[PDB]
Amino acid sequence: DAEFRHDSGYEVHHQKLVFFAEDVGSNKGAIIGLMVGGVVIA
Instruction: Tell whether residue 2 is a contact of a copy of itself (CB under 8 A).
Output: no
Annotated binding-site residue? 16: no
3-9 — which CB contacts under 8 Å span 24+ positions?
none
Taking the C-alpha atoms of residue 20 and residue 33, their distance in angstroms, rounded to an integer, is 27
Please report, as residue ranges, which positions from 4 to 33 form the binding site for a copy of itself (by CB under 8 A). Answer: 13, 24-33
Instruction: Tell whether residue 3 is a contact of a copy of itself (CB under 8 A).
Output: no
End-to-end CA gap in the chain: 68
**Which residues sit in the known binding site for Zn(2+)?**
6, 10, 13-14
Contact footprint for a copy of itself (CB under 8 A): 13, 24-42
